[PDB]
């Protein structure tokens, strides 16, 4: 428990809470007056409470790191347990893991048993191979088999390393061990019995979310007065001091917002409070943001909670249903519950769409419970206006259009800026909010059946009747979007567990070869030629700048003096791998290192050499380039448009574009494929500027999808839905 401060940097662990674990377990845990059964109960509940006390104050992605360690503590298997923590038509990357696993005596069967089975290909391509795993290795215990197939599934499909971990814990500590995380936070009970006075209630907030409203809701719930003062002003500091003194004297509730901004007074508060004996049921709440600024001593003292978008579609509906009170959702008419369920479902869809970014939503817009609260207020107002004095309303008389417009424009669409995201929000709101939603066989996704109730009670059990086997197909996004994140979590398991268990010489070798890879570039009113000459000019100038800088680095590293200012900075950014600002003159993705920069630059310089050869030879029309390898692809598009306009003596406005599969190469299409101009759910693109059931797909330079440059009109196959192509996220990519 204590050694997690070297991983999280957010949770700080003290002995007082670990003894509070005994104070609760050994005195308040329900049960029998038999020593052996009592010992069994205490031992079984110790792990449960150890996870429950801790996991409410740390991020969800680490909930599997701690619990699996608690599977080790309760756990002969240690000989083979280190293999998956220090070990690092089958493909090469899977073959490496296979051969590395084959070294163990226990997995000697991997040499020949992998090819004998003809069902292995189906298992590898399975949607969920965690449920059933072929055994390749004295009958073993369930825990031993779980460990063996854990090593095997990492050796075969590391993308499903995380999910197996979740079941492995259930093999040791119980199926319902992690189930209490996927539930609303019981704030009232915890402040009732688990939080003492002289112990601040720390509430961490991931960016894009907060917990200020929770404490106000609690204060209104218990019918108690509370004093709330933020942090950042001297007058506020003095009022907060008066408030904390009065609350200590009288037992009152005190509330401080954004204490991370003033670490001085915050550090003072810890020593003010620990040496004080206050009135009973006196509670101070501090809200903060996760950063390495807050005093560590205050984190050792208080009760830490982490607030964030909860994982999974299931948990979000429970959180929403807990947030709305019981009385409001059950008010007449009975279709109010239906619209509330639809709103909650739509909110869950969008918020989980944010997590699988940028493939679902390119820009990570912030969406919180303020938006849901305003939407619920709007729904209540509309139903009050429409259904005044009546108990039952038809689906057709519901103002579907007004609700759709207001959710699409003001409440949720205001934070939407890109046109494509706005039209996707329109697609959601039109697909879900309609009179078809009240049919018995309506489908929320394509399958899932909507419940056919009228009150709030019957909807509740269906939410947790949803299977835990969740895939992104619930959202509409392709399932392969998991493979980017799940693997990113898998390597997050092995690394975070491992912690739990000269420069000139480098640079000289680093820039001996890089000049060898790079090359040299050789330099009237034609619209294509002017922009091409400008491109070659910029390329030659920046290439010469880079070559001179690398030559200076080589000379200073070899020892030929040149020990100057602004070259040691280049040494620093070259050793660290951060791309220096001296070379970032065009758009590249963030975090893109120097070796990738050189790999891209070599191909760019080769392309510009070919451009120079073509221009020198006009033939500039029949030359093929790849967008993204041009510093300003917008300039190339405009030059093509103006060349067509001048060739045919047309106005520059009256010239639109058609696309067929001017030659443009090097493009890629993600999410679909096309053969005969119909998109089925791009070796060479032909562009024809023509005068004057298709889909408008964007084009982005980088996979981050920051800024758009170009749109393409594509036909669709007859067997596919035009609306679903917005949801799935098919896009044109230049890299």
């Amino acid at each position: 428990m204590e050694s997690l401060k070297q991983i999280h940097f957010l949770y700080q662990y003290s002995l007082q809470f670990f003894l509070d674990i005994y104070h609760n377990v050994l005195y308040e845990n329900p049960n029998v007056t038999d020593h052996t059964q009592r010992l069994s109960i205490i031992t079984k509940d110790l792990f449960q409470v150890a996870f429950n006390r801790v996991a409410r104050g740390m991020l969800h992605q680490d909930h599997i790191t701690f619990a699996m360690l608690l599977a080790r503590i309760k756990l002969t298997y240690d000989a083979e347990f280190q293999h998956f923590l220090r070990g690092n038509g089958l493909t090469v990357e899977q073959a490496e893991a296979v051969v590395r696993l084959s070294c163990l005596p226990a997995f000697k069967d991997l040499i020949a048993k992998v090819q004998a089975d003809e069902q292995f290909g189906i298992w590898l391509d399975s949607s969920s191979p965690e449920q059933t795993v072929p055994y390749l290795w004295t009958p073993a215990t369930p825990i031993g088999q779980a460990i063996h197939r854990l090593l095997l599934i990492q050796a075969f499909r590391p993308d499903r390393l995380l999910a197996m971990a979740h079941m492995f814990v259930s093999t040791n500590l119980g199926e319902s061990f992690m189930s209490i995380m996927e539930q609303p936070l019981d704030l009232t009970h915890i402040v009732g019995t688990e939080v003492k006075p002289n112990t601040p209630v720390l509430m961490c907030s991931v960016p894009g979310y907060d917990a200020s409203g929770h404490v106000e809701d609690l204060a209104a719930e218990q019918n108690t007065q509370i004093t709330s003062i933020a942090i950042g002003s001297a007058e506020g500091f003095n009022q907060a001091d008066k408030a904390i003194n009065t609350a200590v004297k009288s037992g009152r509730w005190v509330m401080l917002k954004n204490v991370h901004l003033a670490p001085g007074w915050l550090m003072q508060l810890e020593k003010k409070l620990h040496s004080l004996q206050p009135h009973a049921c006196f509670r101070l709440f501090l809200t903060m943001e996760i950063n390495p600024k807050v005093p560590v001593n205050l984190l050792r003292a208080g009760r830490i909670f982490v607030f964030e978008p909860p994982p999974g579609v299931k948990a979000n509906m429970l959180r929403t249903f807990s947030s709305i009170p019981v009385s409001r959702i059950c008010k007449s008419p009975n279709e109010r519950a239906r619209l509330y369920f639809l709103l909650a479902w739509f909110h869950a869809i969008i918020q989980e769409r944010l997590r699988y970014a940028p493939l679902g939503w390119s820009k990570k817009y912030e969406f919180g419970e303020s938006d849901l609260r305003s939407a619920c207020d709007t729904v209540d107002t509309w139903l009050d206006d429409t259904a005044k004095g009546r108990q039952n309303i038809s689906p057709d008389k519901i103002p579907w259009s007004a609700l759709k417009t207001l959710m699409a424009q003001s409440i949720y669409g205001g934070r939407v800026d890109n046109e494509f995201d706005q039209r996707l929000l329109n697609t959601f709101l039109e697909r879900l909010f309609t009179t078809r939603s009240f049919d018995s066989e309506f489908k929320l996704a394509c399958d899932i059946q909507m419940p056919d109730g009228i009150r709030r009670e019957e909807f509740v059990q269906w939410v947790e009747l949803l299977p835990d086997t969740q895939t992104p197909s619930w959202l509409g996004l392709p399932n392969n979007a998991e493979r980017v994140l799940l693997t990113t979590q898998g390597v997050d398991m092995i690394s975070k567990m491992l912690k739990m268990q000269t420069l000139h010489t480098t640079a000289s070798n680093w820039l001996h070869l890089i000049p060898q890879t790079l090359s040299h570039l050789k330099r009237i009113k034609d619209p294509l030629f002017r922009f091409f000459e400008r491109e070659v000019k910029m390329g030659a100038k920046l290439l010469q700048d880079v070559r001179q800088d690398l030559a200076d680095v080589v000379q200073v590293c070899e020892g030929k003096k040149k020990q100057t200012n602004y070259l040691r900075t280049l040494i620093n950014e070259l050793v660290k791998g951060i791309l220096p600002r001296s070379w970032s003159h065009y758009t590249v993705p963030a975090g893109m290192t120097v070796i990738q920069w050189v790999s891209d630059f070599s191909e760019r310089i080769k392309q510009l050499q070919n451009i120079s050869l073509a221009a020198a030879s006009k033939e500039l029309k029949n030359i093929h380039v790849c967008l993204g390898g041009l510093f300003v692809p917008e300039a190339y598009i405009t030059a093509t448009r103006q060349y067509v306009a001048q060739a045919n003596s047309w106005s520059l406005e009256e010239l639109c574009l058609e696309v067929n599969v001017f030659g443009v190469t090097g493009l890629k299409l993600q999410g679909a494929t096309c053969n005969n101009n119909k998109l089925s759910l791009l070796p060479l693109t032909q562009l024809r500027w023509v005068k004057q059931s298709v889909v408008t797909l964007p084009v982005y330079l980088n996979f981050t999808r920051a800024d758009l440059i170009f749109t393409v009109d594509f036909e669709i196959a007859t067997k596919e839905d035009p609306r679903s192509f917005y949801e799935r996220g098919v896009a044109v990519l230049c890299t």
């Binding site: 979310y209 300003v632 106005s651």
Partner: protein, 1092 residues
């Protein structure tokens, strides 16, 4: 006057006046209540009057026009929604009447569009353009409603529009009118908003109104955001107009304290006004939470009213229900902070990232009076998009919506001017070309001009434009330009580009209230606007007054003013006092053309405090609630170098003029220098003037076309220096050296009164001085090898006679007053120092480097121009400067050191100690305490003032302000103080040394820089052999060991300097002062023994 700044935007108070001129009158023979009742009864009459012909199938022009002229601008437009909404409500309640209403709107639009084609007064024309804007909104909304079939008013498509309900039976005349919306139900404020300027109601702007209408129906605020220049503040103003309450616009900077916004909210609540706060991206992170507290506390009382008092600065004060807060961010830009997450919970956010440029380009162009505005807008908007996408990535371009609005208003002005010059047809496609040439063409670099004109030829085929000429102003520039010895051109001569840029600047000034300059240092910005102001003052007869403020050197508290926190007291800054004196009109400043110029570099912390004066309704805000309405006749200018650290929130507001380095060529500098030399005497026809004119006649062949100086200068940019070479410094140093040549000829004539100088010897002196001065001005700040290479090139270019030494570079010669070369070895005799001065402070062993540098420093300090000495540590800058000073019994020195956290206050304290103040009729002059005796400020470390975030030191800017204008601003009385007898000499190590930054070019232009290197084995051996011979006289028997000892230490210091340097430790500095400590130690050890 005071009503202009607090109470709405009216001018002064029988009735209420306005800036544009329209005046209301009281109905009934308490400022707020009376004027609202008067407005309500006016609207009550207006609705009944306009409902008579509401079914406008056929409209009588006379009655319609006199109804426009009878009533006010805000009432006519408002009564044009009231009648519309009632008519459409009646029609949709009962689609024939809907089509009839569409036809009525079309007929009304046609009759009003026929009026603009005829000449109209501006007073009626503004209202009529606003009515065209409204009625285009009406026709587009009505055709949208008919396009998608509707059945009743309960459908959202009708429900989500600005429908206006009028109740004739309402007793409360203030509650007589209401406006509706999606869930909203408001009452119109009936404040005398006035005319102002009605926006274009685009669909994005429609979403913008709708979201904040929903927010204000509930108790929340409105938070437009997105890239700058898309219509956030103007959208909030549009809500204020459409809902009838004037919105106070406040620009926010770090100067706010919590008490300031405390009284802002108290003032808003006590009267019931609206607030629009422009910035929450620079108001400090902790302070954002500190004010989130207050803005959350007010909303609770607001909701309690919804179901009265609230706490504001620990005071229970009443809150009127008619209150609203809107904010604005400019997110995503570099020079800004983040927001706390709790604040966003209180506020609805809508993004302005793509305003509808087509319909805004259409409707107002059509309202101005363009017959074919549809095609013109359809051609100009994609032209803007093409210009944005294809032009090169320059940080100073600005093609947002503000640029389009400026271009089209310029087109309207051009149309009016052409109508006055000449009716139905005047080529309208050429008007847009002329407007683009007036506004957009000047700000492009020379590379992109062909691209822009190719676009103009393509998207606007034909109608090729011919550039006009303002011959009166051009002849005025002929008459004023030559007075100050400046060259003129015809637009095709050698000096035509510069005067064309001045004319372009005049054009931008006429239309853009905010003006700005961008270009490399020394391209003629200051001279350009100075000659323009002088010509304008001589032509129109209106006195031209210029104020200059350097904001970077001055602290922000001193610049803009600062509130005293102990007791709220408003101490004004520079700009605040300037505006106060212009507004108060103590001397008559309102009748004079007055410009305010901001030189220095840009930085976001001060430029964006002016974002509230460069918009519509130009007005400055201060934390104390004091507001300053900007004068009409003034212009705020910037004179900056580049915008590598500026954001588009202020780069788009101000019209731009760009100077390339080729605008000001070398020949014009030569002509200016020679004209100044011929006309103005150096000492202040006199003998000095005769010598000057003779020298100018001698040297004129060398100062034109290629000649010699230009060939040398373009050959010199291929040779590296300490730092980046600039042309104009390199020529100013030469000019000063030539002035010293004239003074030296005067000295020679003073030596022999009976034998005046002869021309045949004068040439032999002056060509030799020319080549010597070219050498030391072009290779002063460089290594000796660079000096040798440049010597060789200068030898090849010109026929000036040269030494015949086979292997002596020409830099190592002196030009004698006799008019011939002399080696420098004649002035460095081998001298023996005294026994007690073997090693002492302020002792100089003469060597050719030392004497050469002494001569050069003498030449630059003789003219009393600033100077900089920079080279590696130990070179001898301090002692060489002091040696040069010791030969001059008319100047003393003040040593001064700059720390890395230094301030201008250090120099101010030094001046307060060593100098004094006196009030003269000419103003305030800072005088040295010794009369007639020069006072030098030696700065031992010039390149380490405090380094700001955005690449500009403060003290360097202060010394720049000292040098260029000969003074500064004394902040105790914020007044102009000018120097009398102070020159600035400084020194540094090279900027390539590790902790030292490079020096700004705009200050490097003024000061010449000389490179002083450590002597090395050539001269150190001589120097310390002299010291060893002088030191081994204490022991007569050891005098034979002076030579082999010097060769030893000098070898070891050569052996140790190459090994240990800054690459291993920060303070591994090797200098000849180590040899000074050497000889001091050996001398103080051998002094008293007397036998070793």
């Amino acid at each position: 006057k005071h009503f202009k700044k607090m109470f709405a935007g009216v001018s002064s108070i029988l009735g209420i006046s306005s800036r544009e001129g329209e005046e209301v009158m009281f109905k009934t023979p308490l400022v707020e209540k009376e004027m609202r009742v008067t407005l309500a009864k006016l609207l009550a009459e207006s609705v009944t009057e306009v409902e008579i012909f509401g079914k406008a199938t056929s409209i009588d022009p006379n009655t319609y026009i006199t109804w426009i002229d009878k009533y006010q601008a805000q009432l006519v437009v408002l009564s044009a929604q009231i009648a519309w909404s009632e008519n459409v409500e009646t029609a949709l309640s009962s689609a024939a009447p809907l089509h009839s209403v569409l036809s009525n709107v079309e007929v009304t639009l046609n009759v009003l569009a026929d009026s603009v084609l005829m000449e109209q007064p501006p007073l009626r024309r503004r209202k009529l353009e606003h009515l065209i804007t409204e009625l285009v909104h009406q026709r587009d909304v009505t055709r949208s409603l008919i396009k998608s079939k509707i059945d009743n008013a309960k459908s959202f498509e009708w429900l989500s529009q600005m429908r206006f309900y009028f109740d004739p039976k309402q007793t409360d005349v203030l509650q007589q009118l209401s406006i509706q919306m999606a869930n909203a139900k408001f009452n119109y404020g009936f404040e005398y908003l006035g005319v102002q300027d009605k926006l274009v109601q685009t669909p994005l702007t429609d979403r913008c109104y709708l979201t904040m209408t929903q927010a204000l129906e509930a108790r929340l605020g409105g938070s437009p955001f997105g890239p700058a220049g898309t219509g956030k503040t103007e959208s909030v103003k549009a809500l204020g107009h459409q809902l009838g309450r004037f919105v106070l616009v406040f620009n926010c900077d770090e100067t706010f304290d919590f008490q300031a916004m405390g009284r802002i909210f108290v003032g808003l609540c006590q009267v019931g006004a609206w607030g629009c706060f422009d910035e929450f991206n620079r108001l400090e992170e902790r302070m954002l939470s500190a004010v989130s507290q207050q803005v959350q506390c007010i909303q609770e009382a607001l909701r309690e009213h919804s179901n009265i008092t609230c706490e504001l600065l620990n005071k229970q004060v009443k809150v009127s229900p008619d209150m609203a807060i809107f904010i604005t961010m400019n997110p995503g830009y570099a020079g800004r902070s983040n927001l706390p997450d709790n604040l966003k919970k209180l506020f609805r956010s809508l993004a302005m990232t793509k305003p509808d440029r087509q319909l805004i380009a259409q409707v107002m162009l059509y309202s101005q009076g363009f017959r074919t505005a549809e095609v013109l807008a359809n051609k100009i908007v994609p032209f803007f998009k093409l210009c944005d996408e294809q032009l090169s990535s320059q940080s100073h371009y600005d093609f947002g919506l503000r640029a389009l609005k400026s271009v089209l208003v310029s087109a309207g002005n051009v149309k009016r001017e052409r109508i006055q010059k000449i009716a139905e047809n005047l080529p309208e496609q050429e008007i847009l070309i002329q407007s683009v040439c007036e506004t957009m063409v000047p700000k492009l670099v020379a590379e992109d001009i062909p691209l822009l004109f190719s676009l103009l030829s393509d998207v606007f085929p034909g109608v090729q434009y011919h550039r006009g000429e303002m011959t009166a102003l051009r002849e005025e520039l002929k008459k004023v330009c030559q007075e100050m010895y400046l060259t003129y051109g015809d637009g095709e001569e050698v000096g035509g580009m510069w005067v064309e840029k001045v004319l372009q600047l005049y054009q931008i000034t006429q239309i853009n209230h905010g003006l700005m300059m961008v270009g490399p240092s020394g391209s003629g910005k200051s001279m350009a606007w100075r000659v323009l102001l002088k010509a304008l003052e001589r032509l129109e007869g209106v006195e031209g007054v210029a104020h200059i403020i350097d904001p970077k050197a001055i602290s922000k508290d001193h610049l803009y003013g600062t509130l005293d926190p102990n007791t709220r007291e408003w101490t004004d800054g520079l700009f605040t006092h300037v505006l106060r004196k212009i507004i108060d009109s103590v001397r008559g400043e309102l009748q004079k053309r007055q410009w305010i110029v901001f030189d220095g570099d840009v930085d976001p912390e001060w430029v964006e405090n002016l974002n509230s004066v460069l918009d519509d309704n130009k007005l400055l805000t201060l934390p104390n609630g004091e507001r300053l309405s900007l004068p009409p006749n003034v212009r705020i200018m910037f004179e900056v170098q580049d915008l590598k650290y500026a954001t588009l929130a202020t780069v788009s507001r101000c019209g731009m003029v760009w100077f390339s380095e080729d605008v000001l060529s070398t020949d014009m500098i030569f002509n200016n220098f020679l004209a100044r030399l011929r006309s103005i005497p150096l000492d202040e026809a006199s003998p000095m003037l005769q010598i000057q004119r003779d020298a100018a006649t001698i040297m004129q062949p060398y100062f034109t076309s290629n000649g010699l100086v230009t060939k040398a200068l373009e050959h010199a940019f291929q040779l590296e220096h300490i730092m980046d070479l600039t042309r104009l410094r390199c020529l100013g140093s030469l000019f000063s050296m030539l002035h010293q040549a004239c003074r030296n000829v005067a000295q020679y004539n003073a030596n022999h009164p009976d034998f005046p100088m002869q021309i045949e010897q004068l040439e032999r002196y002056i060509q030799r001085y020319l080549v010597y001065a070219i050498l030391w001005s072009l290779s002063g700040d460089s290594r000796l090898k660079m000096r040798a290479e440049l010597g060789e090139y200068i030898r090849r270019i010109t026929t000036v006679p040269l030494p015949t030494a086979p292997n002596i570079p020409i830099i190592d010669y002196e030009v004698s007053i006799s008019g011939e070369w002399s080696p420098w070895q004649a002035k460095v005799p081998q001298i023996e120092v005294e026994t007690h001065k073997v090693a002492a402070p302020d002792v100089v062993v003469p060597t050719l480097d030392t004497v050469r540098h002494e001569a050069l420093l003498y030449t630059w300090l003789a003219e009393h121009k600033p100077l900089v000495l920079c080279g590696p540590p130990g070179s001898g800058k301090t002692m060489t400067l002091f040696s040069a000073l010791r030969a001059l019994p008319d100047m003393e020195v003040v040593g001064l050191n700059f720390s890395s956290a230094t301030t201008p206050e250090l120099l101010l304290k030094t001046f307060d100690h060593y100098c004094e103040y006196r009030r003269t009729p000419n103003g305030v002059v800072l005088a040295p305490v010794q009369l007639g005796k020069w006072l030098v400020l030696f700065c031992d470390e010039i390149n380490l003032p405090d380094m700001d975030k955005y690449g500009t030191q403060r003290v360097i800017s202060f010394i720049r302000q000292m040098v260029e204008h000969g003074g500064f601003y004394r902040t105790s009385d914020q007044t102009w103080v000018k120097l009398e007898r102070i020159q600035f000499v400084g020194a540094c190590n090279p900027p390539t040394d590790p902790g030292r930054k490079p020096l700004s070019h705009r200050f490097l232009r003024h000061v010449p820089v000389v490179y002083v290197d450590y002597p090395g084995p050539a001269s150190l051996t001589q120097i310390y052999g002299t010291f060893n011979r002088a030191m081994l006289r204490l022991i007569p028997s050891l005098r034979t060991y002076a030579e082999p000892l010097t060769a030893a230490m000098v070898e070891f210091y050569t052996m140790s300097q190459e090994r240990f340097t800054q690459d291993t430790q920060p303070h591994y500095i090797y200098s000849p002062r180590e040899m000074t400590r050497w000889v001091r130690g050996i001398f103080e050890a051998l002094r008293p023994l007397e036998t070793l």
